[PDB]
Subunit: 247 residues, 4 copies
Amino acid sequence: SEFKKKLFWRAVVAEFLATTLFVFISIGSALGFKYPVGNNQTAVQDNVKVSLAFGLSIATLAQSVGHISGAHLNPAVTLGLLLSCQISIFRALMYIIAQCVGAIVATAILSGITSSLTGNSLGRNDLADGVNSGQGLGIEIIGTLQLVLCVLATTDRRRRDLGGSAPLAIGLSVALGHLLAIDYTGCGINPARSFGSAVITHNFSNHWIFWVGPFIGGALAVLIYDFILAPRSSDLTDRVKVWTSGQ
Amino acid sequence: SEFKKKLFWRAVVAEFLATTLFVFISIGSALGFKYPVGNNQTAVQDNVKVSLAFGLSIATLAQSVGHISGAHLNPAVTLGLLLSCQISIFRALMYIIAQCVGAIVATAILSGITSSLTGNSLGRNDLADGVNSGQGLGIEIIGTLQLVLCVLATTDRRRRDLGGSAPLAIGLSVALGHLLAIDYTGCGINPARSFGSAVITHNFSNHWIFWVGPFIGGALAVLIYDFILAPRSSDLTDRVKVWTSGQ
Amino acid sequence: SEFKKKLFWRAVVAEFLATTLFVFISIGSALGFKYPVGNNQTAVQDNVKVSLAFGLSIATLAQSVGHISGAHLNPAVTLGLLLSCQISIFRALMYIIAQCVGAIVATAILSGITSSLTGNSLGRNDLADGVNSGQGLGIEIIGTLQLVLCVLATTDRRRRDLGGSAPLAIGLSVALGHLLAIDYTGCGINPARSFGSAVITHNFSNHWIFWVGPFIGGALAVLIYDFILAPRSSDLTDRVKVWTSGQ
Amino acid sequence: SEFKKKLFWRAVVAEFLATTLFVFISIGSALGFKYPVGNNQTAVQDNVKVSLAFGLSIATLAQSVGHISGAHLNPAVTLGLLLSCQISIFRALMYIIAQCVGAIVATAILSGITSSLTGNSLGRNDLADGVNSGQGLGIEIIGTLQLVLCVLATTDRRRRDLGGSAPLAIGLSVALGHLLAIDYTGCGINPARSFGSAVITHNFSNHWIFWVGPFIGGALAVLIYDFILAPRSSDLTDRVKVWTSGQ
Ligand SMILES: CC(C)CCC[C@@H](C)[C@H]1CC[C@H]2[C@@H]3CC=C4C[C@@H](O)CC[C@]4(C)[C@H]3CC[C@]12C
Ligand SMILES: CC(C)CCC[C@@H](C)[C@H]1CC[C@H]2[C@@H]3CC=C4C[C@@H](O)CC[C@]4(C)[C@H]3CC[C@]12C
Ligand SMILES: CC(C)CCC[C@@H](C)[C@H]1CC[C@H]2[C@@H]3CC=C4C[C@@H](O)CC[C@]4(C)[C@H]3CC[C@]12C
Ligand SMILES: CC(C)CCC[C@@H](C)[C@H]1CC[C@H]2[C@@H]3CC=C4C[C@@H](O)CC[C@]4(C)[C@H]3CC[C@]12C
């Protein structure tokens, strides 16, 4: 079905390109404070800068390509939309592949651009000292839960009260996730974004957190929105058809 | 009446869950600068980070659940809407109970997540040194007054000039309250948010400020908007019916 | 005419109250970094914090009272609207009186709240070292020019392309003015806001800058918008009638 | 054609004036942290402050003059719109001349205002230490690519899903570009803005980067949007007519 339609593959390519741009811009901002290189200074990360980088990247790329693909740019968001039966299983798989590959490409280009930084961590996500696996998992779950809940509400399509920029809302939710999580885990909140850094650095220590936590958060957001707060008056069996149809 | 309608209890549950998420995200951001734990650094709170955390949390959760409950997430806002006769007394009581319980639950989960921080104040609100009870009370009154005034104006329903995102407006008002009050009192501006920290820490010193000041601010905002700036052409006796009817 | 209409005086009172709230919130934010008092720390002003305080105060108060008065809260903006013949001379005079009195009241209340700060400058505007009168005047002129130009464009009423929140646009313009001018002059950009601090501190040194520069900026913005970029197809004599009529 | 129409020349003058204001405000913000002059302090640039200065300047000036000219204020954006055949070749040339001259005028006025700063670099763009020409070129290409892509999408005119403020979207994209690029290259992304500083300082070292990279980014954004993601159902030959007709 969608496999043979130009619009579907345009959406897949848009997801790939937008994820590449998002990862590159955001992680390049995160690495920015390490320059100048020679200057021996106790330069400290600016958390507001990084959070705004991620959030405004999401907002800008949503404004740019959401009408083409929905501007997921996040495997957790795609999983939320899959479980809320808004996209097909095939579209979800292709979107997640595109997001991961785009994150890998962005992080490789970034490692090329930032070659002067010694021991460049490439914005890899890991637990901060004093934060164990369960605590970082909880932080990741909550950040992804709020992001996916915002996405599910913003695109409900039963709503007539919405006003303003939906891309700005999603970008601000991403910025909020980062403001919460940068100090604890680096704020994965986006399994593809963490995967790119882990792959390029050849370091997967504690990496399962940044896949499991965001997916748990997305699943909980779907549960909360679709079955507790704003249920639909549609038989589940009918909604299941979207998985193999995309309609 | 509303006690037996599924929509009402969905709104109550939405208020509980959204208050939990808001408190957790915001206070976790506020505690973030204390990590890493072992690193002996004179790390200093970033006030813009915390203010944006609170404000963007409110904006995101409003976008997510406002159509379900109105997204009060603040006992002072609920009291403002009660005194402006927009909600019933029962809905106000249930909303405030839900907000307090959600704040308690969020702060307990956070105390679990941040166990590595010694003497974790859990973002408890107290007067800064050089600020006595009356001065902090004034700061709290003004912050809550502007927040409640913005909420009352944004939802006037007599207005045809409104544009953009109402959730963003309310979140930005919350961020403004924090930008004002973090240095003086920690910016309660939200009696449930202060109550959760006070309950979890078992410390209620100067806690009456963070209930009285926000309620005085809400009452003053109601007085200003409903009886000075934008009066309604409706007999007060009719508006009183909403308290026992919710209509 | 308007002298005997309840709506006009409601607008005047709204301008007074909103200017009071704006000045109090913003200058209280600006003074915040001096707390705690006893703590001997080389605490440094956060310019982003103060700029956002001013801008978001303007945005919130515009959302709250613009439909009641237009939410000028700035004598320079009122002068711009007077010279573009949108308000009457009487309304401009009453608005500017209300703005100045509200700024005075806010700064007095703030001086009460911040009594623990020794030598409290109360956010008074003055030239920074290395900035002479002409240079600060230029900074003030440009900041007020951009603010007044944004206000004139946002309320053109010939425009069908506008989208989003006009209050947010004006608040962001104010934030921009502060981001530019805080380091040079303290960013008056609002003669009433500077007047309140000057009156309460009993210090008027270089105060003429913060009245002249903003008025020059407003006049230049009116010239640019109304006579270079977006002229109206109306005889000037007809527009002059608004001064004595307000229509 | 347009050469003899008052609207076209009003648009050109608007581009000149708005570019002047944008450059002045933004670079004056960037130079702000060097004041006070006498105070010997290890004052450090605030990257969030500068990024917001640039972005909010673009947002405010877009709101003010976009309906008059489209508020390009950036030769790279004008080139993107030229290659997407939305403007004529003549309008593009006049706009770029106006933008460059406005940047020069703004930087000259700023050098006058900031005369107390010794060795005033006037916000000139150059490569940071550890960043060679190719790496800075890549940063510039990506920043301009995201900006131009956002502009092309926001003004597609085939879109019915857009909501909120387009000026705010473009300003936030500019802020994102700065958050990415300030630490690497000083954040050009606007060849006129870099040209003004280079001309006033009489320093053109590595200046070709800040013309080539932004134009490559704009060209790639046009390619991506117009030929990969959102193609138009119009013969290229017809679109070429706009270059000599502006229609
Ligand atoms: C979207 C694309 C076109 C933007 C980036 C393209 C160009 C400018 C970038 C991408 C990868 C970069 C290269 C990556 C790695 C290095 C190795 C280093 O020892 C010298 C510079 C060099 C050789 C870089 C030069 C600039 C470069 C070629
Ligand atoms: C919304 C929910 C599901 C997210 C948080 C859930 C999980 C990941 C969190 C919540 C409470 C957390 C626990 C709270 C307290 C402690 C005690 C400490 O000495 C070891 C870790 C441990 C045992 C935490 C592990 C992680 C934890 C179990
Ligand atoms: C909008 C209004 C109601 C909010 C502020 C009202 C109250 C809480 C404020 C306003 C002015 C304040 C007073 C101003 C000055 C001082 C003198 C100082 O040595 C002790 C505290 C004291 C006496 C303050 C106590 C608190 C105060 C009374
Ligand atoms: C848009 C315009 C009107 C705003 C700026 C205009 C005025 C206030 C500015 C622009 C250029 C400025 C001058 C530029 C250079 C210097 C040289 C210095 O040694 C003394 C101050 C002096 C002489 C400045 C005084 C103030 C000034 C005249």
